[PDB]
Design an enzyme around this catalytic site. Structure first.
Site, PDB file in Angstrom:
ATOM      1  N   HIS A 102       0.804  -1.213   0.000  1.00  0.00           N
ATOM      2  CA  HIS A 102       0.000   0.000   0.000  1.00  0.00           C
ATOM      3  C   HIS A 102       0.848   1.279   0.000  1.00  0.00           C
ATOM      4  O   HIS A 102       0.324   2.381  -0.152  1.00  0.00           O
ATOM      5  CB  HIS A 102      -1.059  -0.016   1.120  1.00  0.00           C
ATOM      6  CG  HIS A 102      -0.569   0.430   2.466  1.00  0.00           C
ATOM      7  ND1 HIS A 102      -0.236  -0.457   3.469  1.00  0.00           N
ATOM      8  CD2 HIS A 102      -0.473   1.664   3.015  1.00  0.00           C
ATOM      9  CE1 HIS A 102       0.034   0.207   4.577  1.00  0.00           C
ATOM     10  NE2 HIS A 102      -0.102   1.496   4.328  1.00  0.00           N
ATOM     11  N   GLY A 115       2.169   6.594   8.609  1.00  0.00           N
ATOM     12  CA  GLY A 115       3.528   7.062   8.406  1.00  0.00           C
ATOM     13  C   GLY A 115       4.537   5.992   8.775  1.00  0.00           C
ATOM     14  O   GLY A 115       5.687   6.025   8.316  1.00  0.00           O
ATOM     15  N   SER A 149       3.742   2.809   8.315  1.00  0.00           N
ATOM     16  CA  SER A 149       3.448   1.785   7.302  1.00  0.00           C
ATOM     17  C   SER A 149       4.648   1.353   6.474  1.00  0.00           C
ATOM     18  O   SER A 149       5.415   2.192   5.999  1.00  0.00           O
ATOM     19  CB  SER A 149       2.367   2.300   6.352  1.00  0.00           C
ATOM     20  OG  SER A 149       1.148   2.441   7.035  1.00  0.00           O
ATOM     21  N   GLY A 150       4.782   0.043   6.273  1.00  0.00           N
ATOM     22  CA  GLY A 150       5.890  -0.486   5.504  1.00  0.00           C
ATOM     23  C   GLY A 150       7.102  -0.786   6.369  1.00  0.00           C
ATOM     24  O   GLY A 150       7.994  -1.519   5.946  1.00  0.00           O
ATOM     25  N   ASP A 188      -0.142  -7.551   1.917  1.00  0.00           N
ATOM     26  CA  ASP A 188       0.372  -6.190   1.897  1.00  0.00           C
ATOM     27  C   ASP A 188       1.909  -6.215   2.061  1.00  0.00           C
ATOM     28  O   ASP A 188       2.452  -5.970   3.146  1.00  0.00           O
ATOM     29  CB  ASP A 188      -0.305  -5.390   3.001  1.00  0.00           C
ATOM     30  CG  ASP A 188      -0.065  -3.909   2.880  1.00  0.00           C
ATOM     31  OD1 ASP A 188       0.425  -3.459   1.837  1.00  0.00           O
ATOM     32  OD2 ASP A 188      -0.377  -3.193   3.839  1.00  0.00           O
TER      33      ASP A 188
END
Ligand SMILES: CCOC(=O)CO/N=C(/c1ccccn1)C1(c2ccc3c(c2)nc(CNc2ccc(C(=N)N)cc2)n3C)CC1
Ligand SMILES: [Ca+2]
Length: 223
Positions: free
Chosen positions: A40, A175, A177-178, A84
């Site tokens: 995402h 923020g 995320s990942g 994801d």
């Protein structure tokens, strides 16, 4: 990161910042030329920033490398956030050293109760928006599948796991995320989603990296 602490410059050497004129997602360096992040977080024009602490000041130790290609999992579903995960290939190999190092992929999945370190430059507030300059850290345990599924009925797939605190107050957030969820020196999760941040009975949901080790290796080997 909500309710966390300042990591300390370069104490999380595998932490990466994805930048497109601003920080938008985190990532983990898995070898000198590959980063793992969340699907995402996909966007064109990605600059990978390694060895960062204060993302707004050039302090030394930073390496800015453009992504040559981003590989979103072919079965990623934007509606369910299932699968994801995304692999990013660097245009050039990073210079590995004390402050820029790679994190190991797991050989087995982590059990409930396992304490992990989550990190990132995401929002530090549950109600409102406040982004930090320096990297924040949070130690949180992997929750049981039953508690995870009870918190998000019908939204947890076998490629996800919950980690955090049911009492709320400490969690990853937008923020982050990942970014990495490291347990016992192995990358076990990727910051994915959640309902709000640090809310009671709404822990963070993470991509279960152990389900993707074969895919990661095969993909890296062919690109
Ligand atoms: C903000 C608008 O979002 C929407 O309109 C749709 O949200 N749809 C879902 C959803 C998730 C799984 C299965 C079905 N539907 C969601 C959802 C889905 C994806 C999301 C999300 C929230 N928030 C984010 C942003 N990042 C984020 C947020 C909270 C986190 C946390 N608490 N640890 C960690 C990371 N991303 C990325 C409400 C829970
Ligand atoms: Ca910097």
């Amino acid at each position: 990161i909500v309710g966390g602490y300042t990591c300390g410059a370069n104490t999380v050497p595998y932490q990466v910042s994805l930048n497109s004129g601003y920080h938008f997602c985190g990532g983990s360096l898995i070898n000198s030329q590959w980063v793992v992040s969340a699907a995402h977080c996909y966007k064109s024009g990605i600059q990978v920033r390694l060895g960062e602490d204060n993302i707004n000041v050039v302090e030394g130790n930073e390496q800015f490398i453009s992504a040559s290609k981003s590989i979103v999992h072919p079965s990623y579903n934007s509606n369910t956030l299932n699968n994801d995960i995304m692999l990013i290939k660097l245009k050039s190999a990073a210079s590995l050293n004390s402050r820029v190092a790679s994190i190991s992929l797991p050989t087995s999945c982590a059990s409930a109760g396992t304490q992990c370190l989550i990190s990132g430059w995401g929002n530090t507030k549950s109600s409102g928006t406040s982004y930090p300059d320096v990297l924040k850290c949070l130690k949180a345990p992997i929750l049981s599948d039953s508690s995870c599924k009870s918190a998000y009925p019908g939204q947890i797939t076998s490629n996800m796991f919950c980690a955090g605190y049911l009492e709320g107050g400490k969690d990853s957030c937008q923020g982050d995320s990942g970014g990495p969820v490291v347990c016992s020196g192995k990358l076990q999760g990727i910051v994915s989603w959640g309902s709000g941040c640090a809310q009671k009975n709404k822990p963070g949901v993470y991509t279960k990296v152990c389900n993707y080790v074969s895919w990661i290796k095969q993909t890296i080997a062919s690109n």
